[PDB]
Ligand binder design. Structure first.
Ligand SMILES: c1cnc2c(c1)ccc1cccnc12
Ligand SMILES: N[C@@H](CC(=O)O)C(=O)O
Lengths: 157, 157
């Protein structure tokens, strides 16, 4: 014996196998979130430029930042697909189902804001309560993280 | 049964010591980038609102938004302090170094724009090259994730 947080190599390797998977699935959800907030930033960046005051030229001035929001949303959907494809560990089943619901709602909302700016509808872009769908997903993400944490801690025992 | 990824309980334990610290480092770094990105979305949602009410809409949430970016920015810096307070691992020292530089620089970009927006000066806001610096830190963070992953893989088979 010369081991300390684990009762045997079997136990130790067990915890590794369980944690390395939690680590993969939490990684895809960090990237999803990152590129979804990147999409909301590019959308704001497009709209401010849309809004710069030439006269009757109106709110639609050379914005290649909307294609940029279309790209970061597609990449977040790519990271999300990997997670979605990864079946929940039993203990995780419900934390993930919650993150999928809050995610389908916030991706819809961002895709909805791209079509608004795409058709020049500024008021609809400004009026969407995007912040609540984001806060909801942020809160289902910290909960999924509490629940991985708990399972991670149960390995060194 | 199975097949082992570790030649002994000490080899396995040694990987856990490394991995668990890497895990913590990375948690605070992701939490810094998150909050910096919500500061950016708060600032940009305020700057688009500062340009309204001029034959266009609502405007009034732009200082709630500006007060909320001061908070996410203070939360971002407290997270980075946790990360700075941690033991830099030899394999991570260079990556860590590159992250500090780019961090320091974007935190300070963000803080100037809060100031410009407090003064109501839109022109100062758009004259600042924020996105450059944000992409710079996204890059350094990607590299750090890349070098972090390398060290973690060598912890097993
Ligand atoms: C490498 C990486 N993670 C670990 C180990 C080795 C060993 C055990 C273990 C237990 C719980 C969580 N992670 C690990
Ligand atoms: N509703 C959009 C745009 C805005 O309010 O500025 C958002 O929250 O991103």
């Amino acid at each position: 014996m010369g081991g300390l947080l684990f009762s045997s190599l079997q136990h130790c390797q067990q915890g590794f196998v369980i944690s390395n998977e939690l680590r993969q699935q939490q990684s895809e959800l960090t990237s999803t979130w990152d590129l979804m907030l990147q999409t909301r930033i590019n959308l704001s960046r497009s709209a401010a430029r849309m809004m710069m005051d030439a006269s009757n030229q109106q709110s639609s001035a050379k914005t290649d930042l909307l294609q940029n929001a279309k790209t970061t949303l597609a990449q977040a959907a790519a990271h999300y697909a990997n997670f979605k494809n990864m079946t929940p560990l039993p203990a995780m089943a419900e934390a993930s189902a919650n993150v999928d619901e809050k995610y389908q709602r916030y991706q819809a909302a961002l895709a909805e804001l791209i079509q608004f700016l795409d058709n020049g509808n500024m008021d609809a872009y400004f009026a969407q309560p995007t912040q609540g769908m984001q806060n909801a997903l942020g809160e289902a993400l910290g909960n999924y993280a509490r629940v991985s944490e708990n399972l991670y801690r149960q390995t060194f025992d």
